[PDB]
Symmetry: C3
Subunit: 213 residues, 3 copies
């Protein structure tokens, strides 16, 4: 993608786990980010699901240069522009649309959009995309659905998200078409409150080590 200095591919190959973060209290954002990085996890997807999401991205971009912070739940060009202005290095959407694909490919940061069907995948491919999220992974029919969906497209790569846990992420990572998975367990909503970051570091370290072979 000519307008993207950082490729979507590089974002996904950084590590085997991309945490799907929901941040309710802004003050927890930076420490949380540092804790994840200290555990070996650098690509951070801050979902636009709370009022302070954009401000958390901005704060993490400024105070934690060691993170590759991005946005999640980007639903339209308007939000895409807002997270870009805030410093997102990448954007994730749970699905795709023509206006979002047009705005993203014309913009400066990579978009890795979710798909659930081959038709949706083909529409992203019409805009030159090769990297996608497979969301909701389990609900779309998990590993087997993903193996079927990917069968006719040898060059495509995914980051399945949705119902993935330490119990099954290895099943996904074993696939040739999968580069990494998205998960919510590295940052327990209740771990935030009270200032419990060592817990988060530990979980991240275990996620990374549990991913090998």
């Amino acid at each position: 993608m000519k307008n993207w200095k950082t490729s979507a591919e590089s974002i996904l190959t950084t590590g085997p786990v991309v945490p799907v973060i929901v941040v309710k209290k802004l003050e927890h954002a930076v420490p949380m980010a540092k804790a994840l990085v200290a555990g070996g996890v650098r690509v951070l997807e801050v979902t636009l699901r709370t009022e302070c999401a954009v401000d958390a991205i901005r704060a993490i971009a400024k105070e934690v240069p060691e993170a590759i912070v991005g946005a999640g739940t980007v639903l339209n060009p308007q939000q895409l522009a807002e997270v870009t202005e805030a410093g997102a290095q990448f954007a994730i959407s749970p699905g795709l649309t023509e206006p979002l694909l047009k705005a993203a490919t014309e913009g400066t940061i990579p978009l890795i959009p979710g798909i659930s069907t081959v038709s949706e995948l083909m529409l992203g491919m019409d805009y030159g995309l090769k990297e996608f999220k497979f969301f909701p992974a389990e609900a779309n029919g998990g590993v087997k659905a993903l193996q079927a969906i990917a069968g006719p497209f040898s060059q495509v790569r995914f980051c399945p998200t949705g119902g993935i846990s330490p119990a099954n992420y290895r099943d996904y990572l074993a696939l040739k078409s999968v580069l990494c998975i998205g998960g919510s367990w590295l940052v327990p909503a209740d771990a935030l409150e009270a200032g419990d970051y060592d817990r988060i570091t530990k979980l991240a370290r275990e996620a990374v080590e549990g991913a090998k072979l």
Copy 2:
């Protein structure tokens, strides 16, 4: 929606159950409508699946003005225009398309379209819709699928239809994102054959009572 004097939201918040109606003999339409209204069920989806469907909508709008009569299985702008002219107060589609979303938003009655994936949901959201049918519910993976799909979208509301019955409607109604469900069991064929409209009134009454809490 600026062109819609009756909102899509008000159609779905009217009651917990929207009967999905397949009218084979025109003469049954009006008495069936009155019987459903007597039992407290007023939002009536007359599917464009039988030859007399548009005539039933027109007869119900004329003889049972208190019912909120609408059309179902609306597949394109041409059908939407026909049911609108016939007196439909709302239109339901099993899936969505851009010309259908465009024609609907340019028109006078609300469209509540079905979606099965987040991408389809996002395309509806680009036209500013917030109310959707989740069809076919069970085959799309039922409750869990809907819970995964709805997780990143806090403002959207659904009316799941497809495989819902007394056995499981409460499961769907309990979700925060669900306002009502679509079902076919309120109008049994044998009650019509018997002219036992009281059976239909009773079933509607039970559907509504069984939905509380």
Copy 3:
């Protein structure tokens, strides 16, 4: 379809099984095709998943006149034009897109595109299509998903492909909405590589026989 001398329907009604072919070695294409025809299987889908695919289609169209050869994995107008020029009698795609639907209906050969949802089906129906692939059949939820999806569309017909084998093709063929199925087992990759043509003829004959009643 006015620009299609051969209807999409005639393609699907020719036989109960359409082999999904992956030809790695160009030299094996013609005798493979003759072996399938000798076993009673004429509609051949040569997928655009190998470098020699378009040449295989050309060689089969010229040399095995009793075969109805077409292309598979057609992803955009460019590929459609190319297989059209090489002699394909039909095109199959794993999903659909407006550009693909528009180029196909303006063209000379039938496109039977795959769908997974009612919205995808409706988009195809906006361009006048009545015949579709249901891909990936099993991952989409198999027979039940297909039954639910087709319930509101009495005129639509399908060719399910994806996870279908002798163990279950009968379950699909028994549906009133199914005209035939697509499968990969008649042409085992290892038989094509070695030139086991009597084996291929035998598998084809068993496929056809096992499909009755």
